[PDB]
Design an enzyme around this catalytic site. Sequence first.
Site, PDB file in Angstrom:
ATOM      1  CG  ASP A 197      -0.849  -0.859   1.331  1.00 46.45           C
ATOM      2  OD1 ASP A 197      -1.893  -0.422   1.864  1.00 46.45           O
ATOM      3  OD2 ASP A 197      -0.673  -0.881   0.092  1.00 46.45           O
ATOM      4  CD  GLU A 233      -5.124  -3.123   3.377  1.00 45.31           C
ATOM      5  OE1 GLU A 233      -4.180  -3.091   2.555  1.00 45.31           O
ATOM      6  OE2 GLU A 233      -6.154  -2.423   3.259  1.00 45.31           O
TER       7      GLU A 233
END
Length: 496
Positions: A197, A233
């Site tokens: 993330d 990401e």
Amino acid sequence: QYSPNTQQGRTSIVHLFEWRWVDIALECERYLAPKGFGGVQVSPPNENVAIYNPFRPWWERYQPVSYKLCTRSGNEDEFRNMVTRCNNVGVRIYVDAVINHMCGNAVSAGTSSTCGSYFNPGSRDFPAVPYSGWDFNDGKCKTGSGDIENYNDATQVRDCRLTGLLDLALEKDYVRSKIAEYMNHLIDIGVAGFRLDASKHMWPGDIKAILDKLHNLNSNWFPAGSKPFIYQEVIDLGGEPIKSSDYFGNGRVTEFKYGAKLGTVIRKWNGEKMSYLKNWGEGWGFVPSDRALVFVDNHDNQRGHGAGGASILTFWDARLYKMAVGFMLAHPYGFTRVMSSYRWPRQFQNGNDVNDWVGPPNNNGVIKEVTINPDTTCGNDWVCEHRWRQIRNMVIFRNVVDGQPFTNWYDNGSNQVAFGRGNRGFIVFNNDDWSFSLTLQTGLPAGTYCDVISGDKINGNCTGIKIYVSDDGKAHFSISNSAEDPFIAIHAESKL
Ligand SMILES: *[C@@H]1O[C@H](CO)[C@@H](O)[C@H](O)[C@H]1NC(C)=O
Ligand SMILES: [Ca+2]
Ligand SMILES: [Cl-]
Ligand code: NA
Ligand code: NA
Ligand code: NA
């Protein structure tokens, strides 16, 4: 890091967004395994802040309180139980790792957390880890607000707070170690990889340092020397100093340009059309195929919340969506991830959805179980796109043609295109405002094939459209611009 570690022959993972561990465990055994799904991306399994204003939004799971595997999806035991059962049927588990930050700096101290752990954002104390003021980037960040203010400055993007989220000092071995302790536990338990993330917000070198601490995958379920699959990401649309290629040394990267452009071409924005997809992939400025984690939409941008603009196609645009997902699963570019969502009361005002914060289906904040209806669709407002016939069959299509080259491309100079994957599969699309009726070279062996979009091959017959391939590999296709699903797909395993 670049290999997904899926069981031989499975080529996609599904994001079971906000699903509880028990439901995922059941889904692996009852659907994902028999349907050839490669794995599942689970929502953050670590304890997060329980936010009541708004009421338990989906995004509260991106605000860590500790690394205890205790959330609304389940506790530590339910999580292991899930990983074990899924691995046992050959379906992998990929953890959404929120390791760039902890919660918002303004969140009130207390025990409003999913596991009751105490935490104090203001004093920078997260005792359950434990983290203290020494483990955050307060001194390091250079901006006047302490938050990221300008993306043209690659430094503040990494050292300052993303929308106020307390930024961990990832250069410290202590912090790297607490994160690796959390990730190695998950690995040893059986997880096959991770979604890192907010990677754009972490230095490529810090991620690398943490990865150096990671074990190989569980040797009881995986081959010796298997490294966890890593997909970072990074939303890179091209106008910033930070490029997703800066992260290739750690693993794959999410290719957000993929869904953004597939959305504009299929929506036919700015004069774009499907005939342009002939050179889809790197030709469009995308990262190399072997470093791409692709998807039409993701949990964030499906609610306009992320990046891709209003061009992003979602289950709300069911017809065009199935076609977008179909093209993606048929094309050899990247490693595919299909989205699986829940319905929320989308409410547009002045162009923005005021209910884009709404968390998963729940009863008093308790996430609802995923009920399976007789027709195999889901109830309790879970969309279950991975269960739509047109999508599940293309997931299988991808498996069937794996390794086969992109060939026999055709286009009418507009929006009626088609292409094959070696001699194992062929797909045809019609996104023009007029019918498509034409004989195409399929590259497939002669025989009768079931169209897997309109139907299925069952008990030696087809429930939908049937395509007849001749000795020269040619086959006639007819698609009305008014068809329920304006595309047809056939493959080696749908042949009668
Ligand atoms: C296929 O279905 C038809 C009825 O629609 C039946 O006559 C035929 O025997 C079936 N073939 C097989 C192989 O099951
Ligand atoms: Ca950071
Ligand atoms: Cl993502
Ligand atoms: Na393998
Ligand atoms: Na993000
Ligand atoms: Na290695």
